[PDB]
Amino acid sequence: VLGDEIVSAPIKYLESLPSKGFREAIIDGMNGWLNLPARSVSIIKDVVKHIHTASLLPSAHIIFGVSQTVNSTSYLWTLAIDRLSELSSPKSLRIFIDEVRKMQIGQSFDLHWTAALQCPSEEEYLSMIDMKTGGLFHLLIRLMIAEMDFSGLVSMTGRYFQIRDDLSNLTSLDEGKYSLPLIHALKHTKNKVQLESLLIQRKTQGGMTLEMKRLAIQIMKEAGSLEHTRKVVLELQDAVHRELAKLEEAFGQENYVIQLALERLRI
Amino acid sequence: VLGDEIVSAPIKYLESLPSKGFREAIIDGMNGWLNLPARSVSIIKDVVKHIHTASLLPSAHIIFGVSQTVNSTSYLWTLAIDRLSELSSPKSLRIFIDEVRKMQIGQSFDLHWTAALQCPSEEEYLSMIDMKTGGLFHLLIRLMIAEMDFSGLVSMTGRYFQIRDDLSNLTSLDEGKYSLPLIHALKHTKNKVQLESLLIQRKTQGGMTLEMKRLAIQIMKEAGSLEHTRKVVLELQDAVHRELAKLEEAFGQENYVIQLALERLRI
Amino acid sequence: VLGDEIVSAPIKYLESLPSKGFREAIIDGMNGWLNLPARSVSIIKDVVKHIHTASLLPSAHIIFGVSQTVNSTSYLWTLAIDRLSELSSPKSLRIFIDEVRKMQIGQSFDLHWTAALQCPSEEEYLSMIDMKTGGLFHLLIRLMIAEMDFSGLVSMTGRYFQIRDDLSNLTSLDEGKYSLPLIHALKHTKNKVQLESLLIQRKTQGGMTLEMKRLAIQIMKEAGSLEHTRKVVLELQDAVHRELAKLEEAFGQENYVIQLALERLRI
Amino acid sequence: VLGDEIVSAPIKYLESLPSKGFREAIIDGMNGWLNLPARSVSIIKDVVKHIHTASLLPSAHIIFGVSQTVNSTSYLWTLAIDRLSELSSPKSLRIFIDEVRKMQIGQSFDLHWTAALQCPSEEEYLSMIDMKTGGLFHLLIRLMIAEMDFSGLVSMTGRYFQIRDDLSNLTSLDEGKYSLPLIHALKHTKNKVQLESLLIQRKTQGGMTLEMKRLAIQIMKEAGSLEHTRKVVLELQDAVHRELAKLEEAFGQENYVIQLALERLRI
Amino acid sequence: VLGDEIVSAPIKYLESLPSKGFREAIIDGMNGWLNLPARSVSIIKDVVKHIHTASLLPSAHIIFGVSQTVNSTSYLWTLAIDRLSELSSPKSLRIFIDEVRKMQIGQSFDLHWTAALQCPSEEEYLSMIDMKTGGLFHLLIRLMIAEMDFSGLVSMTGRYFQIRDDLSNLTSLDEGKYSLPLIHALKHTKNKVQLESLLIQRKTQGGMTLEMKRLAIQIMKEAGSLEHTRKVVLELQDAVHRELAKLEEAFGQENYVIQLALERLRI
Amino acid sequence: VLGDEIVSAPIKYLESLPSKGFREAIIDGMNGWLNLPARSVSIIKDVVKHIHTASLLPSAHIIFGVSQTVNSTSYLWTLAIDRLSELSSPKSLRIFIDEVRKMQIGQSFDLHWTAALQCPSEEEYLSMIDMKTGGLFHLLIRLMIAEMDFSGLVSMTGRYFQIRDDLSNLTSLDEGKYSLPLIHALKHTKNKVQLESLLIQRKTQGGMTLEMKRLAIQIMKEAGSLEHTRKVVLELQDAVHRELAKLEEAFGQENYVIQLALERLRI
């Protein structure tokens, strides 16, 4: 008899590291608007956690290797679908599979843009982040509804989260991911050749050094990208706050925890 | 609008390479016993092909990289579950998830034994290969029945296939996988230290050279492992042929294509 | 007293390897049209050889290292300018420097396109090869005249030489240079993602394997690129042959050695 | 139309980094003795800067790669010769080419001594540094005169600058260059085998560690090399100061800026 | 004429680094019980130092390379046997060779356990450390006696020294050696798979990082290994102190320097 | 109880590979001149075999690693001294240790010359090979005599063996060892810089390629080194044959097996 002690080790490792439960907060804040049993909420939380963990997969692949990490990712997919199988709604499978399909397509495009050293436009990047990030958000929304319109709020929340994380990473690069400040700088700078060469050498050497990071940040600063993205974040935050109010006026109630979660992520 | 042309590229590469359709032959030979519509057979074939391809995932990761390969593996899981969702039977999901769980557990143990340089016993290795290989076989069987006892035939077929492949690889090592001849040699040889050191150096250097392969093969030959495994294969072949007859006498019919498929893999 | 025995060793190494004297043939065939002393022809030959050798710089950098190769390249530049200083014409320096500037700009663009993994258009590639290849050719022409119009013949000869070399290399890849068949295939193929991934992995691993080369060649063949480039070569050959006639009818003489050199490079 | 935006990027990168204008100070201090128009002084400054930059070529080859750096070095040579072509004197080309030849020969010997792990004598090292360093200095002198005897002052200044830089680097190794303290230590030490092994291992590993650097510095200190080189620096400083006076008494004027530049480099 | 200045350099390098003369203290404290001439004591000290240095052979192999280190190890063996040849006793050779044989067998087993990633039992590890460490100790004892029973004191002293060093290293891993806390943790922990994977990845990558070291130390702490080994050390210290008394009562004298040496290593 | 199964594995591996028993032939041919018991001859053969094997230590370090190989080398030294301890002569230890000391010094010089990239002279190389090779030969001779003058015959035989092996290796490089043809070429060639650069790049890259080997052999051939070494081999062979006769006339007997062994190594 062989048990699930080896395949579940990376899963039990990355599911114990602390994290800010923004998705957990949204789950705990939306069941107030439409009432659901505690078991359904727990099932939805488990499914969302499994999907996010599988998206993530020191790093777990450093401790456990690559092949074991891939096997554990497949096991995570199986666990998530098994947990989803217990829901009462009969259309949960279609929602799950199509949202996961969208997330996977967005992730593939995000990987390909970085690998091929081709910079996307702002519109293409926004569409990609919409897919990749809001797939989980409106999977959550659809699963909760099945067991008003939420597309605009989901899109604004995903964009706000992503570009706010971009500012938190830069203002406060070594992976080569094309963020919004990098996209803006690559089209509004005089040292375009220098920035392109920096990206090419980062790809070649496998990473960037501290001096290269300082030079790239300086080139970004002289282009004014770090202010344009801050203005974008301010606009997105205002859009999210105004989108939440339109939903609050239709249900005849105010969510005092979703607003608290948003205030915990203020600018 | 972003399409599935990047995520599906690795999938469309290994699904075009030719292969011996032994599983396809079994599918085409078992629906003769119990009749099924062509659409159900096509769906089952697609599901089995997707599961096998995901198990597999020049190598595709050489052409497309590692991250893209993992993302395409997740996409393959989603495609397989979506295709399975069209079946008429209501218990297909449970069969699918538990068989895939067994396959993943077996694969995890197979990876861990090679990584940790610990040789399993013959019985434990046989149990592992039963899980890992026959999971797909009796997933196929259960899916066809849902839309007599088959456990013995599945177990014997999986073992026969695996150790026959081991002989085809050896008699006619660079990955470090523990086969049956290696397990027998490691317990019935005088140059145990030399074989252990060869395995350790293969792990350290990332591969084995031609001279090391010749030395390992000669050590195996001097221990008589290559004849013990041939006797095991002969016994397994006889067991499979005698197990098929017991099923043929209960359905009141003879399968002239499963027998042909087995004859195509004679010794 | 320190001599030039170390700096000149890489120079004396590649100046002894045999080569097809197409440029030497052009020099020996055009001075028939306009007569020059033997000393001027020898000086022009030496200058052209030095420039070509500097453009080139087992490989010499394998035997002598990288830094010594760069120092020897600078020594080649100094030797070429010193040899040019002995010419009677007073405008040789301007011709030399502007033609060398054109060659260097073309080489820089050729390097950058390969490094950045960005495919040029056919017009851009043709302009780049015009600069890079015909810079030496019409440097030769201008120096010989100084001591009719030749721009069309020079451009046609440079393009014919370059794409003929491309066909000779392909029909009869590991460096990543964007040739004409590759440019045509990248815009007229169905397996665009596979070809792009092959190029990316070639850049990442530092080279391509035999199986990858076979796959890329087969992808190019399925797109019909290898026939389009052959048609282009035939058109360029006809253009060169018709361009030579217009020059032959203006000088009132026929060159029986330039035609022989072209016939030595027939298709 | 292809421009010089890629080839000139490494040039425009290192021409903006700050540096101590000792050569600029010498140019601005010697034109006081013999008067020249501002345009000639600017041309000489540009030529000297281009030659020094080409000699140099985070590091620019880290940001831009190796091939682009070599192409930009060739572009620097072309730019320097083009700028020199505007001078009124007719013998500027010969001075330029022979001084550049001397510099290149000295650099070749300096590279070969380090590569071959053969320690030069003190006289050979002094001759090499004379060539390599004073080539630029008396190129500057000859170009300025063309548009008294200066050989002794140039030699003394070059030696003083080089060994002063050696002391500034050591007293206040990872490249393997044979300095004066290393040459003295290798012939006046008891741990000769240890020092030779340290140099060999530095060559093999590609660099030296902090502990190896401390051990080498301690071995040098125990041999008294760091005091012998300081005495040499003091003697060279006195020689330079006494050589400047002999020139000041022949022109009937005192240079109050060359003396200031020397005082900025006091011991 | 070729001298021993290259072969003896690593020997003269590692014999000058300071060390705590515990073995020297034991030698100086045991000749008080049985009187010996100063020449014999010096010879025994030299032999013991040579044996220990050969066991050891920045690291000397970093400065001098690998082959030179092996040749110097052989030279150390020759020097030790030559020094031993001057002793008056006729059975010194047999004692020397059999004790060195025991030391080499213990070292071989210690290397093999780490290389093969197989954890020994506590009893087997204790036997291995007995051989490997106490071989030198009771070689020293036998050599001094030849020129009461000491086996128990030697065994207890060797074990106390080894596990005390283990605590000094851990409490106050990158080589993969199996200590006592690691052995206890690997059999009394819940995260067995994580610890095994950490060891496997340490072997694969050639070393461990700071985060991996912290994780391993925390896993050991949660298992209570660091307290079990401290209790073991306390028991061993008490055993050594009680074993010394039994020897002190038979010779009718008290050693005031061996006791001081033990007090210098209190807990 | 831990046995000698791990430490003796490389010893039992390299002592089973076939070899031409030239030293065995000399032992079997010289005991005819002076009669010795079979046990003494067997002991001497075992000691010589152990010393040669320790000198040697696919390669055994490839199969078993480096640390295990060093431990087995130390075990070989212990085994050789233990076997020598059974001889009846009382001065065997001094002969053994001083001859082994000479061999080790010669090996150290041979390693250092290759590591430091410094070419020895012909006389110094001959002295080094005399030490390193004839140490074993006249250790054998002295051991047999203890249980006429043989220095000249031993020296001539060692030189003949070594240069014959070098000539056979070259005429019929990747390790960097300075042979006699290489030493002669480095002082009698025109492409000295090219050969030195080839050696430096061989050291840097860790080995030489086939084209580099062909180039080096061609440079050697153009220098006439391959004929000078053949003349040296012929002279050494004549010297050995004339030295054997002088010994044959003093013992009043002819050795019909030493002459056979020499004839088996004719030119």
Author numbering:
A (entry chain B), B (entry chain F), C (entry chain E), D (entry chain C), E (entry chain A), F (entry chain D): 397 to 453, 468 to 557, 564 to 588, 602 to 696
Describing publication, verbatim:
Both enzymes use dimethylallyl diphosphate and isopentenyl diphosphate or hexaprenyl diphosphate as substrates, representing the first examples, to our knowledge, of non-squalene-dependent triterpene biosynthesis. Structural analyses of the terpene cyclase domain of TvTS and full-length MpMS provide detailed insights into their catalytic mechanisms. In summary, a novel family of chimeric class I TrTSs converting HexPP into triterpenes was identified for which two subclasses can be distinguished.
Further insights into triterpene biosynthesis by PT–TC chimeric enzymes were obtained by cryo-electron microscopy (cryo-EM) of MpMS. The data obtained for full-length MpMS showed that the enzyme exclusively forms a hexamer, whereas PaFS forms octamers and hexamers with a ratio of 9:1. Analysis of an MpMS D114A/N115A variant with an inactivated TC domain demonstrated that HexPP was produced by the PT domain. Interactions between the PT and TC domains in MpMS were further investigated by cross-linking the domains with glutaraldehyde. Additionally, in the hexameric structure of MpMS, each TC domain is located close to a PT domain, with their active sites facing each other, which allows for direct transfer of HexPP from the PT domain to an adjacent TC domain. By contrast, MpMS lacks this tunnel but has an overall larger reaction chamber for full uptake of HexPP, thus allowing its unusual C1-VI cyclization.
